Every structure is written in structure tokens, then in C-alpha cells.
Design a binder for this molecule. Structure first.
Ligand SMILES: CCCCCCCCCC(=O)O
Ligand SMILES: CCCCCCCCCC(=O)O
Lengths: 259, 258
């Protein structure tokens, strides 16, 4: 009783559609439709970070994709980490086009724990970490403009349990992230219980995530309870790299449950 | 154990990312490796329409080569179209290169022009399957860029590679500006005293394509390298289909021409 589904994958900071390559392959081989998107200035998106200081422009690729979805079509929307904010806005805007939303170690703000709160905590876990650095394209009087992930940070905090070739891949592809302002994010991502909250939600925890500590993740799960919490043991931050098969099986299960 | 420095240059539509398996093997083995993105390739910031001159496309490699102190020799590896890039680097900084390696690369020489090799190579890409061209300069002008299609990648390029690598490529390949023959001919000028002074190895890595192999054989005949090596079971992207084999071959070459 095969039922073709449409998975939409949204990456985390510094990454792009490319990070989902193992999952995309498994999905396509299964006969499912899968769309891996590059958010603004990510992957091979043409914009450069400094060219998109407005958060709406970082999210535009997903919003535009959602708006173009055929009528009556439902998707399984998956967001990894920072990608959680993107799918959250998609849920609030197009709740009817989403069968179920999946937050993979994702920022999952809610009415009782808004985006600014989540982003501030998220920032503290990345800014200043190991060899990560910021730039000041607008001068020292202004806030730092972009954040650049360093190879040591990637090796230790993100890809510690992934094949070494995936770390090499990431080092050749990660791009800078514009340090979006708190006020800008708070105005772009506003969630309501009747829209955002009406979409089925599942959170997937990576048990060995050294990028985002469990306390923070548990905080979001507690202050904004999802319909279900799944766990993938032995996974580092990039579950799609370290535990691809398990993630795939888990996504299929989720898709069949909320179809 | 002597530490070596490998510099890897990709083919059309690709970028530094395509060498990820090789980069990992080299780094874990203790060697230094630099995989470069040519213009408008991988995460290079330029877009194809911004680099209409072949010199613009080669810029990343030439800037890198210029930054190398003469005593820091490298093993320069070029894949397919990347052969033209390393050829230019060989003519400009011949002494900084211990040995140049052409992996199924376009290897023009005095007896076989760069435009000649480009036209031939392009025949197997232009108009193939779902590949397409754009006309950013209007319909009354030659096409401006070439875009590799998914079916073309699956059937002609990644046909012997893991399916996940095909997925990776589909999410990363970028358009190639259709450089003019006149431009290429002016940019890639080689001399026996400079280009010809660099040790050169050609790696034949093709399968199921007699014509492609005939083309590689033609270049080897018209521009004889110092040595020719083979890698079997490889599709267009040897670094994806036969990584361990390519890695060991590059190390063998490096240890020989040191
Ligand atoms: C809006 C800027 C906030 C900083 C980004 C911190 C999130 C790191 C998580 C990730 O996406 O892998
Ligand atoms: C740069 C001049 C345009 C050449 C035509 C395209 C050939 C691509 C060859 C390759 O890497 O397989």
C-alpha cells in the first residue's frame, strides 16, 4: 500500500540543501518526492549574506516554495536547527499545506517561548565557540554583521560523530550567516495557537548533540509541547550525516502516522 | 613520510566539494590539500554572468598559485575542463609545480589547441539529454551559459557512483559560462620552455564510452605526457566512483615525481 509523499527539507545555519544528500537519495530511491531548499545566501543560492540583512529575505526561498505548492497537496516539512524558525513561519502562514512538521534538533519557538528567546539562547551556543568568528562590515559602532563557522567548531561541536568525509564536505561548503537582529526576527516569526499550533508537530532529539545542549532543547519541548518526541541515539548535531538511515526510517514512520 | 601538498581543480559545473572523499583521505593521511572553487563554482561568490572572460573563471587558481612561495612545491590535479586551468598555471608558475596530473583532463599542447580540445569535449555535453543553455544576451546572440541537467548527471556523469553522490551533485552543480573560442585561445597559450618543462601525468579513467576514450587517446598522442596511468570502473567523476583508487594513484604519482 505505497503512498507517495512529499518531504520538504530545510537546513540549519551555514548549511544548504546539500547537507541532506544522503536523505534525499534514500527518499528518491523510495519513489517519494523530496525538495531540499537553499535558504538565503545558503548552498548555491545566489545572494551573498551581506546582501540580505532582512530575515524575510533569508526565509524567502521557503515562503516562495510554499506559496507555489499545488492545491490540496500536503507536505512533511522538516527543519534542522535554525531551520526550525523557517518552518515555523511556514506553519503559521500555510498551515493547511502541511501534514506534519518535524523539528530535528530545531529551534521550536511557540506562543509561550518566542523566537527572540530561542535565538538568543541559540546564539550563545554558537557565537564565541572555538574558531567561530564575526565580521563588522558596518563598522565597530554597529552590531557584528555576519557569523562564520570555523572548521574546529564544525569538527568538535557539529560533525563529531559523522564520517570524516562529511566534515571535509562541510568545510568546503559552509557559508556565512548574517547576524539577523532580534527585533527583525520577532516581527517575522509570530505564531498563533490556531494556525501554527494546529499543525501536527514532532521533535527529533539527537542524543549526542554537542552543538545545542539538551537543557535548551528540553526547555523548548516543555514550553512548547509537540505532538510527539522521537529520539535518535548516537547522533551528533547533523543527524542527516551521522545517522542517515535511522533518520530516514523515522521520517517515513512520522509521515505514515500523520498522513 | 614526506608531507606533500595536493591542489585539486574541478571540472565544469562542479566545485571544491566534489573532491570531498579525496580531501578526507589526504588529510587523514597527513598531507596538505587545497580543493579550489573556480569562478562561479561551488561557493565562489561570482555568478556566471559576472565572469564572461575565461581569465575570470581561472582567477581563483591563479590567485592561489601567485600566493605560493616558490619553495613550496605542489602536485596540481585537474579534472576534465579543469585541465585547461592547470595548463595555464603550468605556463605561468612552472617551477612551483612538482608534477601536474590530468584526470581525464583536457590536456592541450603545441600540437593540439585548447579550442580544439574544448570543442570536442563540449560535443559530449551541449545538447545532451536534459542539459540546456540560457540566452542572457538575447535570442540573437550565442547562448550565454550551459546548465547540467539531472538526467544527464545520472546517465552520463555519475552512472557508476553511489546514488547519494548524484543527489549531492544535483543540489550543487552550477551553470558554466559558454566561453568564446577566441577568448580561450588567447588565455591558454603554452610554450615548450615553460608548460613543457613541468612533469605531467595523465590518468585515463573512463568506462562504457569508447568515443570518450578515443578523445583521451587523441590528446595523449598529440601531446605525449611523461606517463599515463589507468583507473578502471570509473565514470566521469572518478573522485566519486573510485576514491580509494584515485587517492592511492595520486600518492604514487607524488612519491615518484617529488
Ligand atoms: C539568527 C542568528 C542566530 C545564531 C545561529 C545559532 C543557531 C545555530 C544552530 C544551527 O542552525 O545549526
Ligand atoms: C569553458 C569552455 C566551455 C566548454 C564546453 C563545456 C565542456 C565541459 C567539459 C567538462 O568538464 O566535461
Amino acid at each position: 500500500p505505497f503512498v507517495k509523499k512529499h518531504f520538504v527539507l530545510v537546513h540549519a545555519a551555514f548549511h544548504g540543501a546539500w547537507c541532506w544528500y544522503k536523505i534525499v537519495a534514500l527518499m528518491r530511491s523510495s519513489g517519494h518526492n523530496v525538495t531540499a531548499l537553499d535558504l538565503g545566501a545558503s548552498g548555491i543560492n545566489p545572494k551573498q549574506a551581506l546582501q540580505i540583512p532582512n530575515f524575510s529575505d533569508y526565509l524567502s526561498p521557503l515562503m516562495e516554495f510554499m506559496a507555489s505548492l499545488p492545491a490540496n497537496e500536503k507536505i512533511i516539512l522538516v527543519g534542522h536547527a535554525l531551520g526550525g524558525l523557517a518552518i515555523s513561519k511556514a506553519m503559521e502562514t500555510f498551515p493547511e499545506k502541511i501534514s506534519v512538521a518535524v523539528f530535528l534538533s530545531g529551534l521550536m519557538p511557540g506562543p509561550n517561548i518566542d523566537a527572540t528567546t530561542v535565538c538568543t539562547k541559540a546564539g550563545s551556543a554558537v557565537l564565541g565557540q572555538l574558531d567561530n568568528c564575526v565580521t563588522y562590515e558596518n563598522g565597530p559602532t554597529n552590531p557584528p554583521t555576519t557569523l562564520i563557522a570555523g572548521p574546529k567548531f564544525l569538527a568538535t561541536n557539529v560533525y563529531h560523530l559523522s564520517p570524516i568525509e562529511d566534515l571535509a564536505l562541510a568545510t568546503a561548503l559552509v557559508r556565512p550567516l548574517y547576524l539577523y537582529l532580534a527585533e527583525d526576527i520577532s516581527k517575522e516569526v509570530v505564531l498563533s495557537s490556531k494556525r501554527y499550533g494546529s499543525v501536527k508537530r514532532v521533535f527529533i532529539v539527537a542524543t549526542e548533540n554537542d552543538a545545542l545542549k539538551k537543557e535548551f532543547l528540553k526547555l523548548m519541548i516543555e514550553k512548547n509541547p509537540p505532538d510527539e518526541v522521537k529520539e535518535i541515539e548516537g547522533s551528533d548535531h547533523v543527524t542527516m550525516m551521522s545517522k542517515p538511515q535511522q533518520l530516514f526510517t523515522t521520517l517515513l514512520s512520522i509521515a505514515n502516522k500523520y498522513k
